[PDB]
Amino acid sequence: RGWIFGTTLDSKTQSLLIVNNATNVVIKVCEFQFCNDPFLDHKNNKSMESEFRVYSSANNCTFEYVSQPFLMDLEGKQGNFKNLREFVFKNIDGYFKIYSKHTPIIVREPEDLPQGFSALEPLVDLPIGINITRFQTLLALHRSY
Amino acid sequence: YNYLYRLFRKSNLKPFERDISTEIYQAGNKPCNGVAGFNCYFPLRSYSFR
Ligand SMILES: *[C@@H]1O[C@H](CO)[C@@H](O)[C@H](O)[C@H]1NC(C)=O
Ligand SMILES: *[C@@H]1O[C@H](CO)[C@@H](O)[C@H](O)[C@H]1NC(C)=O
Numbered sequence: 001r002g003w004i005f006g007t008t009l010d011s012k013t014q015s016l017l018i019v020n021n022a023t024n025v026v027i028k029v030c031e032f033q034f035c036n037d038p039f040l041d042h043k044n045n046k047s048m049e050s051e052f053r054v055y056s057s058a059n060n061c062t063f064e065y066v067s068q069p070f071l072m073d074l075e076g077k078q079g080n081f082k083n084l085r086e087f088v089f090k091n092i093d094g095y096f097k098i099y100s101k102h103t104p105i106i107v108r109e110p111e112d113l114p115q116g117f118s119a120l121e122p123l124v125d126l127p128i129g130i131n132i133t134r135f136q137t138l139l140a141l142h143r144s145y
Numbered sequence: 146y147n148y149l150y151r152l153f154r155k156s157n158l159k160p161f162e163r164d165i166s167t168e169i170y171q172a173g174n175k176p177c178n179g180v181a182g183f184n185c186y187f188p189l190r191s192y193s194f195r
Contacts, residue, residue, distance in 0.1 A: 013166070060165070094161030129163040 001040060001071075002138020003089070004054065007131050009034050011057055014130050019138075020069040021049070027065035029128050033057045041142035054138065063128050070123065073102055081105065088120055096126035148192045 005016040011033035019026050019040070032055035041051040073083050081104050088099045099120035107114070153170040166188070169177045173184025 012168075062163075094159065129161055131159075131162065 001140055002038075002054070004034070004038075004136045004138065005130070005132045005134070006034075006136070007133050009134060009136065011059065014062075016128075016130065016132075017054060017138075018070070019052070019054075020071055023069055024066050025069055027063070027126070028061070029063035029130065030055075030061040031057075031059040038138060040138060040140040042140035043142035045142050051140075051142075063126075065126070067124075070098070070100060082108075082110075084114075086118065086120060091132050094127070094129040096128055098123045098126075146191050146193065148194070149189050150192060151188055152190050153186055153188055 001018070001020045003016070003018040007013045009015065011031055013031070014029060015032045015034070017026075017028055017032070022044075034054060035056065038054035040053075041047075045051040071085070073085065084103045084105050086101055090097045090099075100123045101118055101120050103116075103118065105114065151164070153172075154164075155170070158164070168188065169179050169181070169185050170188050171177050171185055175181075175184065177185035
């Protein structure tokens with residue numbers, strides 16, 4: 001979880017972040033000072049809700065968006081099946097578009113993507129006006145257990 | 146002195162895009178290091194309405 005964007009990934013330029021807690025997306029367009037190796041905690045790190053450690057400051061804020069999570073996938077059914085989440089991020093003329101589509105997988109081999117046609121339905125449109133030149137992803141590591 | 150505007154920038158802007166950066170613009174080859182008077186200018190100059 002997490003797709004922070006930025007021109008140089010520091011407090012002097014605005015940045016994005018896509019954090020799905022359990023039921024929200026928390027879209028935040030603000031100036032953030034980022035740690036060297038930001039990460040999160042899968043098991044809510046106990047807490048309360050004290051996992052967030054990506055940013056250490058916020059000088060200014062311009063855009064906010066909270067809604068249902070991008071991930072409708074649920075693992076509570078059973079195991080033996082993995083996910084095939086797909087996203088395309090396109091940023092033009094001061095707009096940010098997100099497309100998504102999920103399908104189940106049968107073969108346990110992760111070496112190659114399965115051969116099959118998939119249509120990526122549009123999900124959400126963003127009116128923010130940031131420049132993006134670098135890409136960074138985030139991870140959820142609660143504890144070694 | 147509450148309304149500012151930008152005068153010098155490296156490149157043209159893309160449509161419907163916003164900048165807020167406040168960094169010294171270098172018109173000369175020599176670096177400015179944030180403080181200089183020759184070939185280095187502060188990007189923003191304020192309005193003054195009377
Ligand atoms: C996760 O963070 C959001 C951000 O406000 C909060 O509303 C929510 O209660 C937190 N917990 C869960 C389980 O979503
Ligand atoms: C960013 O923080 C500085 C702190 O000195 C402040 O002067 C400035 O106004 C802040 N940015 C904006 C857009 O207000």
